[PDB]
Amino acid sequence: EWYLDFVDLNYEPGRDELIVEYYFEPNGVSPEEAAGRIASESSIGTWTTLWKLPEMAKRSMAKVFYLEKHGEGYIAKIAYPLTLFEEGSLVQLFSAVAGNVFGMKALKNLRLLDFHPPYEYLRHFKGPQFGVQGIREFMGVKDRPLTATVPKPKMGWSVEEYAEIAYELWSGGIDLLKDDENFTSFPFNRFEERVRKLYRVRDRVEAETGETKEYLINITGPVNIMEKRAEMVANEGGQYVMIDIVVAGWSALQYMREVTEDLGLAIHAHRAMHAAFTRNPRHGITMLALAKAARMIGVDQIHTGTAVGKMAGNYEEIKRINDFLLSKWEHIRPVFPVASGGLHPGLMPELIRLFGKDLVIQAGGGVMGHPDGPRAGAKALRDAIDAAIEGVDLDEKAKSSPELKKSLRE
Amino acid sequence: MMVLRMKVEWYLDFVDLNYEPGRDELIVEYYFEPNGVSPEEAAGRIASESSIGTWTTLWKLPEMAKRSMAKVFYLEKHGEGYIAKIAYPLTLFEEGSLVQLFSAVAGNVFGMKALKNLRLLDFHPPYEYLRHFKGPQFGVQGIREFMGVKDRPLTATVPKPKMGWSVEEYAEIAYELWSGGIDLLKDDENFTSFPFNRFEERVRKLYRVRDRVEAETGETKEYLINITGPVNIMEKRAEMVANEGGQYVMIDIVVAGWSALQYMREVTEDLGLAIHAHRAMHAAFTRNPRHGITMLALAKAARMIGVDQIHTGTAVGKMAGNYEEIKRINDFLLSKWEHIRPVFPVASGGLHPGLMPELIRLFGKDLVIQAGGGVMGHPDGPRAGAKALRDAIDAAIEGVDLDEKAKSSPELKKSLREVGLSKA
Amino acid sequence: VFGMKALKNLRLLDFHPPYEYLRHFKGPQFGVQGIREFMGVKDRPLTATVPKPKMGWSVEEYAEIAYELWSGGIDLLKDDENFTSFPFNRFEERVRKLYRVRDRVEA
Numbered sequence: 001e002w003y004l005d006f007v008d009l010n011y012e013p014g015r016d017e018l019i020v021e022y023y024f025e026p027n028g029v030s031p032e033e034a035a036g037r038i039a040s041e042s043s044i045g046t047w048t049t050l051w052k053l054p055e056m057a058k059r060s061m062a063k064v065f066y067l068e069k070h071g072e073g074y075i076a077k078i079a080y081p082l083t084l085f086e087e088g089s090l091v092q093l094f095s096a097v098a099g100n101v102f103g104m105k106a107l108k109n110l111r112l113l114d115f116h117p118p119y120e121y122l123r124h125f126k127g128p129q130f131g132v133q134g135i136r137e138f139m140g141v142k143d144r145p146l147t148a149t150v151p152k153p154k155m156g157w158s159v160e161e162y163a164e165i166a167y168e169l170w171s172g173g174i175d176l177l178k179d180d181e182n183f184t185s186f187p188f189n190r191f192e193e194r195v196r197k198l199y200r201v202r203d204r205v206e207a208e209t210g211e212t213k214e215y216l217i218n219i220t221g222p223v224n225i226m227e228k229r230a231e232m233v234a235n236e237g238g239q240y241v242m243i244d245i246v247v248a249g250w251s252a253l254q255y256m257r258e259v260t261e262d263l264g265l266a267i268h269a270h271r272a273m274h275a276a277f278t279r280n281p282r283h284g285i286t287m288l289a290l291a292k293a294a295r296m297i298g299v300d301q302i303h304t305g306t307a308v309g310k311m312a313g314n315y316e317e318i319k320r321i322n323d324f325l326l327s328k329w330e331h332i333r334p335v336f337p338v339a340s341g342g343l344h345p346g347l348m349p350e351l352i353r354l355f356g357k358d359l360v361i362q363a364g365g366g367v368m369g370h371p372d373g374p375r376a377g378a379k380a381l382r383d384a385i386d387a388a389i390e391g392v393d394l395d396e397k398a399k400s401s402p403e404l405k406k407s408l409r410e
Numbered sequence: 411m412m413v414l415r416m417k418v419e420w421y422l423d424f425v426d427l428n429y430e431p432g433r434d435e436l437i438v439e440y441y442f443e444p445n446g447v448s449p450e451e452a453a454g455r456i457a458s459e460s461s462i463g464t465w466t467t468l469w470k471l472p473e474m475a476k477r478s479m480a481k482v483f484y485l486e487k488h489g490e491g492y493i494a495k496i497a498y499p500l501t502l503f504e505e506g507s508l509v510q511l512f513s514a515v516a517g518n519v520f521g522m523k524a525l526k527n528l529r530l531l532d533f534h535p536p537y538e539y540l541r542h543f544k545g546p547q548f549g550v551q552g553i554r555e556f557m558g559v560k561d562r563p564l565t566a567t568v569p570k571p572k573m574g575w576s577v578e579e580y581a582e583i584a585y586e587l588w589s590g591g592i593d594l595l596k597d598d599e600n601f602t603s604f605p606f607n608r609f610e611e612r613v614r615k616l617y618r619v620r621d622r623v624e625a626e627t628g629e630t631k632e633y634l635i636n637i638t639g640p641v642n643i644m645e646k647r648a649e650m651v652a653n654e655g656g657q658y659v660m661i662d663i664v665v666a667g668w669s670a671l672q673y674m675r676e677v678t679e680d681l682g683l684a685i686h687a688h689r690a691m692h693a694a695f696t697r698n699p700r701h702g703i704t705m706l707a708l709a710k711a712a713r714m715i716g717v718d719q720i721h722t723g724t725a726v727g728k729m730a731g732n733y734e735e736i737k738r739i740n741d742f743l744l745s746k747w748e749h750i751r752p753v754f755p756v757a758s759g760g761l762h763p764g765l766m767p768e769l770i771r772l773f774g775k776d777l778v779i780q781a782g783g784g785v786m787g788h789p790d791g792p793r794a795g796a797k798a799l800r801d802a803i804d805a806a807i808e809g810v811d812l813d814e815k816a817k818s819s820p821e822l823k824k825s826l827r828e829v830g831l832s833k834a
Numbered sequence: 835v836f837g838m839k840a841l842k843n844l845r846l847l848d849f850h851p852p853y854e855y856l857r858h859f860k861g862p863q864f865g866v867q868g869i870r871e872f873m874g875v876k877d878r879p880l881t882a883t884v885p886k887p888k889m890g891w892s893v894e895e896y897a898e899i900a901y902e903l904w905s906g907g908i909d910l911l912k913d914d915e916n917f918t919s920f921p922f923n924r925f926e927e928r929v930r931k932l933y934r935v936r937d938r939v940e941a
Contacts, residue, residue: 001571042600043573044571044572044573044574045570045571045572045573045598046570046571046783047570047571048570048787049570049786049787049792050789050790050791051570051583051586051786051791051792052579052582053571054571054574054575054576054579054580055574055576055579056573056574056575056576056604056606057571057573057574057575058574059574060573060574083574083604083606084573084600086602086603086604086639088640089602089639089640089643091638091639091640091662091665091666092600092602092638092639094665094691095599095600095602095638095662095665095690095691096600098665098691098694099599099600099662099665099690099691100599100690100691100693102691102692102693102694102697103692103693103697105729105731152463152465152467153419153462153463153465153471153472153475153478154462154463155461155462155463155474155475155478155502156462156471156472156473156474156475156476156477156478156501157472157474157475158472158473158474161470161472161473162472165469168469180463181513181514181517181518182460182502182510182513182514182517184504184507184510184513185504186501186504188474220509220510220513220669221504221507221509221510221669222506222507222509222669222672222673222676223641223669223670223672223673224673224676225507226669244509244513244517246667247509247512247513247516247517247667247668247669248509248667248668248669249664249665249666249667249668249669249670250665250666250667251638251639251640251641251644251665251666251667251669251670252641252667252669252670252673253667254640254641255640255641255642255670258640258642272513272517272518273512273513273516273517273520274520274521275518275520275521276516276520276694276695276701276702276703277694277695277702279520279521279701280698280701283694283697283698284694284695285694311523313523365465368465368466368467368469369465369466369467370468371468372468373467373468373469374467374468374469540921541921544924679926748921748922749892749921749922
């Protein structure tokens with residue numbers, strides 16, 4: 001059996017079939033053959049063999065129904081019957097549509113652009129437990145973006161040193177303390193010691209300020225360890241855990257979604273390592289597909305990138321990802337985009353004008369750098385956010401917030 | 411009259427080309443190309459973002475920050491870029507957690523605007539890092555022992571087509587493959603559990619067939635059964651396999667991920683199961699020679715945690731990946747490495763009986779040889795194909811010409827004739 | 835009592851528990867007779883050997899020395915007091931191998 005049996009550019013996919021879109025460049029074969037190879041490798045493969053062909057194999061063939069020239073290559077869209085899939089298992093879906101296909105010698109490059117799961121696939125995924133509205137409610141923040149802050153330096157803090165910095169950041173106005181992706185558990189900062197202490201400091205600051213404060217605490221590890229750590233956070237009164245979802249990976253993430261369902265924890269998804277496969281525009285998996293999978297399983301917050309006078313990724317791509325994350329999508333609650341990357345108070349209006357108010361804004365570097373110290377930097381960050389939301393020029397505001405003034409000089 | 415200290419840390423402070431790392435530091439080798447910054451600055455950015463980062467702050471530095479800095483100690487031009495080697499103190503690591511190691515050395519660094527491209531080439535764990543990994547439970551010698559196969563490569567076959575089989579149809583093809591001489595039935599990376607082939611129904615049936623073939627042939631047969639799934643599911647499926655008498659599970663380790671793998675290694679330690687790692691999805695990040703993570707590094711992580719066998723690529727006409735790269739990976743997999751047992755390279759990609767002499771000459775006898783199409787495609791059927799593969803391997807090992815062997819092996823004779831009829 | 839400044843030296847020589855104290859102790863499960871019975875050795879003393887050197891053996895190297903010792907007539911293989919569990923000789927890996935060797939030598 002041959003690759004062109006998987007190609008039919010007149011086929012019209014049913015509403016119960018899953019669609020994957022790929023960019024590809026052929027290597028020594030026709031665009032049609034290459035697309036047929038993708039469909040084959042991601043479904044039943046080849047046969048031809050004197051052996052009895054299994055009865056479900058014809059009903060499991062993928063079909064390329066769209067193929068067009070695009071830049072230096074081609075886009076194919078391919079339809080997949082649900083007989084190919086273990087329903088509820090994102091892991092098995094990606095084993096099919098994002099696996100061996102990337103190694104095929106008959107392609108120069110292959111990029112998985114997007115996928116579109118039908119109702120009968122999507123209904124076996126819960127999506128986020130809280131999402132934007134869930135978080136807004138437990139944080140008590142109805143309208144403005146939320147603020148987050150990873151301390152600098154990002155490693156090396158003892159439990160006590162971390163308690164002290166956390167008190168300054170939260171007290172100065174930060175909503176969310178954030179651990180660095182590399183900051184898990186060390187001899188001088190054991191995870192359970194950190195939990196015991198940091199939630200007591202959190203509760204003290206809530207009592208002194210009257211505002212809800214939370215901790216994007218890094219539970220990343222071997223799954224059994226991440227589960228135990230999630231249990232410790234819940235037992236101490238935490239409503240968030242942070243997981244490096246790409247480093248940890250899809251099998252752990254799906255299970256952890258069941259763990260956090262029982263313990264009432266929102267998931268903050270850090271995407272470290274993503275750029276190993278999401279950066280190259282000709283090859284890998286797009287950040288959009290990654291986000292879509294992550295939203296389906298049910299992260300409540302995820303990093304996507306920013307636009308920024310020093311930093312800044314592709315505006316269009318970021319806005320496409322964010323629009324998807326906030327979009328209506330059947331029962332799947334919307335996800336907060338997390339904006340990070342050289343953010344500081346002066347950038348807040350624009351970040352907000354361009355990306356809206358439904359954001360978690362991570363700005364630790366600017367907060368830690370304030371000339372009056374971290375607590376003043378946090379206020380400067382809340383103070384320029386309030387001004388964006390209200391339509392006030394940052395130089396007017398600065399007349400009644402010297403922590404923002406001191407920030408604007410630089 | 412207070413004098414305060416603004417602490418400043420910058421990228422070039424992470425570069426010291428005269429630094430001599432201790433034997434108890436972890437070393438990572440990177441290839442990179444700078445974008446708009448000096449090679450020094452780029453290298454510094456890597457060391458920084460994989461360690462303590464940079465910053466400007468009045469706040470008191472945490473005491474362990476200065477002892478947690480990575481240092482660039484080697485930096486030289488390489489092709490259109492540069493190689494850096496970077497040294498890491500173990501204070502930066504949660505020991506036993508490869509998840510955390512990779513979050514540091516293989517994380518945010520790949521997304522840095524100031525690098526055009528970034529590839530992690532290799533890493534070298536010091537003894538005090540490595541000693542908190544068990545490595546493979548069985549490795550080469552353990553598998554050889556339970557399979558009862560002392561010298562020759564082992565054989566494996568994934569049925570064709572790769573999806574759609576009912577439990578009964580899969581039992582019938584398995585009987586053929588095993589009976590004709592294949593050592594290891596192998597599930598496709600996509601083939602987990604379906605309405606028409608439920609995992610637990612498949613285990614009950616196939617291990618009965620397995621045991622029947624063992625009784626009939628006097629040879630040990632095994633099954634690289636795909637337990638890939640959400641971690642709890644993978645765990646339950648591993649328990650079902652062990653319960654039925656199985657000694658192997660297959661995990662799609664890249665799609666599943668490191669966190670699940672590390673835990674599954676504890677599960678399999680308890681159940682006596684060897685792990686066959688399928689690497690589907692790797693090429694999304696291992697294929698670009700300028701950017702990503704090499705198959706060698708992935709393989710090293712997987713060996714350290716403890717997969718017992720892993721796919722590395724082959725040298726064929728019809729699948730030839732780079733000979734140099736592949737041989738490097740296999741050499742590593744099989745090399746002495748403290749207490750870490752050696753791992754079988756799994757060779758796959760259009761193999762058939764006529765390639766066995768070349769495959770063995772070039773890559774040795776310590777291989778698992780997966781020969782799907784070649785076996786399933788034999789003109790006399792899959793049983794005959796399996797025999798042809800086993801006979802070609804016995805000949806390669808004995809230094810006997812394939813056409814000489816074919817005189818006492820009808821299956822091998824037909825297989826050889828077909829290649830010629832299907833070759834341009 | 836050992837730290838009292840009013841004593842220059844103190845040595846506990848022996849103690850003698852009365853029946854109502856001693857009765858709340860089981861003593862050995864096996865003792866001499868229990869051991870002789872499960873070892874199948876009725877009269878002669880039993881023999882034991884700790885390998886030399888005392889440390890540094892891998893599981894497989896430890897299996898090979900044990901085979902020699904047991905096969906030549908030693909009754910009891912013995913670990914050195916410092917030999918617990920190491921990266922190159924993990925206790926559970928040792929247990930699995932050494933008892934298979936043990937059963938082989940018995941056969």
